[PDB]
Amino acid sequence: GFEDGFYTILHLAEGQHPNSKIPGGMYASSKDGKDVPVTAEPLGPQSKIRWWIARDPQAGDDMYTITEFRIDNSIPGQWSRSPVETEVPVYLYDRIKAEETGYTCAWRIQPADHGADGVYHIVGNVRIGSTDWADLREEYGEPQVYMKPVPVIPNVYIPRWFILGYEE
């Protein structure tokens, strides 16, 4: 499946062209740091929008971790969420914080029912009749990655992202 690597993760609104030229694309970002929700920002010389995504075999089949890039000597945080609640933020937690809170850091990264290459859903909790999908909302005047519950029925737009690796 999905290859381990160093990626950018671009939020895609319905109808948005992944390769679009109009500015404004918002990428998931670690700029707010550990212990708070993951936010988003556009391209810039001081952006923090690269993530190391790797398979985590111990978490199960097809599961991955999504870990921030750092240049210091601290343990990097990872996308983390409640394994029971929906409509909650995705937090950037290191493993000791994730263990303390009981949060899960395991994600599925599944290609959209035929959408373009690079277009994926980032899947959280799956329940009968409703699955949580990572998406972007505005909270307190700022972008925030969070878990949106959406039933998998015809015509509804399931949240997705354009995930591009380091090399073309």
Q: State which approach was used to obtain the coordinates.
A: X-ray
Whole-number Å distance between alpha carbons of 150 and 44: 32
- Indicate the burial class of 57 (C-beta count within 10 angstroms; 0-12, 13-18, 19 or more): exposed
Q: Quickly tell me which residue has 């493993």 as its tokens.
A: 95
Q: What is the resolution of this structure in A?
A: 1.6
Domains of the chain, start order:
1-168 (2.80.10.50)
Lookup: tokens for 85:
């609640």
- State the Cα–Cα distance between residues 63 and 79, nearest whole angstrom: 13
Which residues precede chain breaks (C–N over 2.5 Å) in the chain?
Answer: none
C-alpha span between 109 and 7 (Å, rounded): 12
3 CB contacts (<8 Å, ≥6 apart)? 165
134 to 39, 70, 91: CA distances (angstroms): 12, 22, 11
CA distances to 25, 28, 32, 33, 136 from 74, rounded to whole Å, are 29, 20, 15, 11, 27
